[PDB]
Amino acid sequence: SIQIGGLFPRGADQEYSAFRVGMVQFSTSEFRLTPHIDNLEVANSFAVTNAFCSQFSRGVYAIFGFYDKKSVNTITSFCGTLHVSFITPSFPTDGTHPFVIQMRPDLKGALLSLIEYYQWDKFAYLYDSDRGLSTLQAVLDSAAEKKWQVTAINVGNSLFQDLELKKERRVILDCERDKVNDIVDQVIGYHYIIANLGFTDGDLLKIQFGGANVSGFQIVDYDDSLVSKFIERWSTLEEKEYPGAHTATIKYTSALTYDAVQVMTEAFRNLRKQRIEISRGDCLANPAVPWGQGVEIERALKQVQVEGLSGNIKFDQNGKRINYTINIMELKTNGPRKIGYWSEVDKMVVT
Amino acid sequence: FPSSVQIGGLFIRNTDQEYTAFRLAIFLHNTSPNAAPFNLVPHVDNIETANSFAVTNAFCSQYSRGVFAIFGLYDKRSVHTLTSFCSALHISLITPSFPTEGESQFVLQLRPSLRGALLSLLDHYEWNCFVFLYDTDRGYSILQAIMEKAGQNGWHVSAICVENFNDVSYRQLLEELDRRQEKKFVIDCEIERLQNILEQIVSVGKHVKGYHYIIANLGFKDISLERFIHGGANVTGFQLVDFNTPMVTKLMDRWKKLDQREYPGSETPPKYTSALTYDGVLVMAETFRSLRRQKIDISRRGNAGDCLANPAAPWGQGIDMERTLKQVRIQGLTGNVQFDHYGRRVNYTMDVFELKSTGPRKVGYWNDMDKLVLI
Ligand SMILES: *[C@@H]1O[C@H](CO)[C@@H](O)[C@H](O)[C@H]1NC(C)=O
Ligand SMILES: *[C@@H]1O[C@H](CO)[C@@H](O)[C@H](O)[C@H]1NC(C)=O
């Protein structure tokens, strides 16, 4: 039996419900996988460091959890130095970082490919200082290369009247989801690209847009067997018992949490089937002495290949998803429909 | 009040000269006759490549030795861990490193922003169409200021992040900007990358009449600009430390006589960061001085001194340390030194320098309240 850490945000209730359900689903008695949970403000490096350090101390073999742009270095540095694997649905780092298994697909290439698909050369880009500027750099770099006229307004700590005089007809929205609703209002013909992986995840449809065109992305495909099968269970769980459950949908970060559980579990079955044993903690020890079996755990995690709610799951040697599909979505009067996909080799594809 | 006062020193890779300036400011304070006196006693870690693991070790080692404040440096990889532990534990950070715009409790940022200075200069020169060459090494504050002022005032900007560019990529890029008739540039990069771009500009032959470069750096004078002097491209920058004041001159009389083996880096004049570092020591001194005049016997007995202690045990007197730090107002090598409630430099000033055939000449200065006043 294998003890692991869990680092959840305090408001992340659906995702912890998806984690609990995954633990039951992906177990067999051949080893107990046993979670140690901490809840915390993931923006706070001091808190995250403490939590990582409590976990290392007890003897976690891997850690599931979260981070934001203020805590990403705490995690990647501590895990990298001490050789503890971290599996997460949080935003993926630009660079390579050993011991980090990124469940979340990169959105940039699909975003960029979609802009080229619609043949947009003028467009406004509304973005969010709270979430990080990683994607804004990619689009500004591509705009300089491809002589796009990108008008880039921060809406994350009116902008209405500046839109009119500059007069940008297309709009890309790379903001927190709560803000998306507010911004459509100011403007009430236009075109919207929602820059995230769960286009249908909360408010949408009758947001409303006044009959504008809306495009977006979905990593969770409710036409898949595994996903519709999963939702049949999820949709009938007791909500008092599983908060954020008993719904027709699941947020993408919650789906990646449940997928995480499968990857961790398969990595440890691989080590048993290959007869690689793992046994047996001070953050501030000097010099740093990484635990010796950590390399084997990392190698098993990146060698996992399974299907789950977010489609085919496979990692390269730096822990990034490869061979994924992102479905391209438009909002039809009927409903959110799939007009195609961006696949990890084939780029944008119609039908 | 006690005879010694205990501080942290946390320095990173490539900071010989800064550490020189720190060691001197503490030596002269510890031996000054000048008229509640104390000796500053430092506890120093130089952590080479700066990353959160190494920065937490250094911090926790210094927190456990009884330091009341930490003079520290960081980069993008360690800034948040170091600010976050400091604000959690009520130990104040005095730092010459890059400023952040958000959102500082217990952190005292000696280095003023270049944002205001940079934007007023673009107004005066009436820049509409230009390239912004940058990196993310000091955050995104400049880039956002620029791309918002492009949107606000209808400009055109070619904004490229030059992080991870090899040397052909620069030539390749400068070739592609050649063909677009792109002549005007703002460059905002870490010093080693700046020097490289400046070499690449030269190779291409873009260092001549017609071409314009605004260099977002605080030490325009320390940039070796010989081929641009000759070539005749117009080049503009900033200079925080004004060498012709008698306070700087007095320091320079000492600095020139320092033994190069004791004080490496003293063979060249002080970079803006070295000058901030000495100013940091003068701010820590003024602050302990004023706490004693206020009649507060600060100590860290017998608080545990384990940084990972649960429950978290903040320093109770950290609040008064912080409040006094932020009210400090003294003169330093970087001119008048004071801050606002959020810890950022305020009522500061810096010279504007233009490159002419005689060499770099002061065409004005910029103050945060008065803005650009020319000559
Ligand atoms: C990529 O994914 C498909 C299934 O989605 C699979 O057929 C293919 O073999 C995968 N590539 C691998 C294992 O390299
Ligand atoms: C700014 O500094 C000058 C001296 O350089 C001083 O005269 C003035 O009072 C200061 N302004 C403030 C504190 O607002």
Range of the domain at A120: 106-222+324-351
Q: At what angle do helices A294-302 and A252-273 cross, to 10 degrees?
A: 120
Method by which this entry was solved = X-ray
* CB neighbours of residue A187 within 10 Å: 17
DSSP run (H or E) holding B337: strand B335-338
Query: 3-class DSSP state for residue A289?
Result: coil
Q: Which residues does a 6 A CB cutoff place in the pocket of ligand 2?
A: B 336, 347
CA of B285: how far to CAs of B6, B39, B292, in Å? 11, 9, 11
CA distance A215 to A105: 18
CA distance A90 to A69: 10
Contact (CB<8Å) A73/B52: yes
Q: Write down the domain spans for chain B.
A: 1-112+244-347, 113-243+348-375
Please list the residues that pair with A314 across neighbouring strands.
A305
Counting ligand 2 atoms within 8 A of each CB, the residue from B347, B349, B366 with the most, and so the one to mutate, is: B347
Token code pair at residue B265: 């880096």
What are the residues whose beta carbons fall under 8 Å from the beta carbon of B124, sequence distance 6 or more? B372, B374
Q: Using a CB-CB distance cutoff of 8 angstroms, which residues of chain B are in contact with residue A39?
A: none
Does residue A214 share a domain with residue A297?
no
Task: Kindly identify the ligand whose nearest atom is closest to the C-alpha of B349.
Answer: 2
* Nearest ligand 2 atom, CA B349: 5
Does residue A329 share a domain with residue A315?
no
Nearest by CB to residue B310, choosing from A50, A73, A141, is A50
Does residue A207 share a domain with residue A110?
yes
Does residue A304 share a domain with residue A230?
yes
What are the residues whose beta carbons fall under 8 Å from the beta carbon of A105, sequence distance 6 or more? A92, A197, A219, A310, A321, A324, A326
Residues 113-172 of A with CB under 8 A from B: 129, 133, 137, 140-141, 143-144, 149, 151-154, 157, 162, 166
Kind of pairing between the strands at B335-338 and B329-332: antiparallel
DSSP-H helix ranges across chain B: 16-31, 52-64, 79-89, 115-125, 141-152, 167-179, 191-204, 226-231, 246-255, 272-294, 318-325
* Nearest ligand 1 atom, CA A312: 5
* CB neighbours of residue A196 within 10 Å: 20
Is B84 within 8 Å of chain A by CB?
A: yes
CA distance B35 to A259: 69
CA of B235: how far to CAs of B133, B147, B204, B210, B220, in Å? 15, 22, 16, 11, 10
Residue numbers preceding breaks in chain A (C to N > 2.5 A) = 157, 188, 280
Domain count, chain A: 2
Q: Which residues does a 6 A CB cutoff place in the pocket of ligand 1?
A: A 305, 312, 323
Sheet of B92-95, strand order: B39-46, B4-11, B69-72, B92-95, B107-109
CA angle B297, B302, B305 (to 5 degrees): 110
What are the residues whose beta carbons fall under 8 Å from the beta carbon of A24, sequence distance 6 or more? none
Does residue A338 share a domain with residue A202?
yes
Candidates A92, A283, A105; CA nearest to B81 is A283
Tell me if domain B1-112+244-347 and domain B113-243+348-375 are identical in fold. yes
Contact (CB<8Å) B81/A283: no
CA of B124: how far to CAs of A347, B349, B371, B372, in Å? 46, 18, 11, 9
Does residue A318 share a domain with residue A241?
yes
B313 and B36 in contact (C-beta within 8 Å)? no
Contact (CB<8Å) A129/B136: no
Does residue A198 share a domain with residue A339?
yes
Does residue A112 share a domain with residue A100?
no
Does residue A315 share a domain with residue A203?
no
Amino acid at B88: A
Token code pair at residue A176: 């927190």
CA distance A149 to B191: 30
What are the residues whose beta carbons fall under 8 Å from the beta carbon of A287, sequence distance 6 or more? none
B3 and B39 in contact (C-beta within 8 Å)? yes
Is A46 within 8 Å of chain B by CB?
A: yes
What are the residues whose beta carbons fall under 8 Å from the beta carbon of B24, sequence distance 6 or more? B254, B255, B258, B263, B278
CA distance B18 to B266: 10
Q: Using a CB-CB distance cutoff of 8 angstroms, which residues of chain B are in contact with residue A137?
A: 136, 161
| Phi (first) and psi of residue A298, to 5 degrees | -50, -45
B162 and B196 in contact (C-beta within 8 Å)? no
Decide yes or no: CATH 3.40.50.2300 for domain B113-243+348-375.
yes
Candidates B373, B345, B343; CA nearest to B218 is B345
| Experimental resolution (Å) | 2.5
Between the two ends of chain B, the Cα-to-Cα distance in Å is 50
Closest protein CA for atom 14 of ligand 2: B347
Candidates B193, B143, B147; CA nearest to B170 is B193
CA distance B205 to B344: 40
Nearest by CB to residue B144, choosing from A71, A154, A283, is A154
Token code pair at residue A328: 């391209």
A313 and A206 in contact (C-beta within 8 Å)? no
Does residue A277 share a domain with residue A204?
no
**CATH code, residues B1-112+244-347:** 3.40.50.2300
CA of B146 to the centre of ligand 2 (A): 28
CA of B288 to the centre of ligand 1 (A): 65
CA distance B216 to B232: 19
- Token look-up 């994924």 returns A324
Token code pair at residue A232: 């049949």
Amino acid at B68: F
DSSP letters spanning B18-81: HHHHHHHHHHHHHH-------EEEEEEEE-SS--HHHHHHHHHHHHHTT-SEEEE---TTTHHH
Q: Name the burial class of residue B152, with classes exposed (0-12), middle (13-18) and buried (19+) by CB atoms within 10 angstroms of its CB.
A: exposed
DSSP letters spanning B213-259: EEE--SBGGGS--HHHHHHB-EEEEEE-S-TTSHHHHHHHHHHTTS-
CATH code (residue A171) = 3.40.50.2300
Query: 3-class DSSP state for residue A300?
Result: helix
Taking the CA atoms of chain A, what radius of gyration do you get in angstroms?
21
Does residue A269 share a domain with residue A240?
yes
* Nearest ligand 2 atom, CA B347: 1
Does residue A207 share a domain with residue A349?
yes
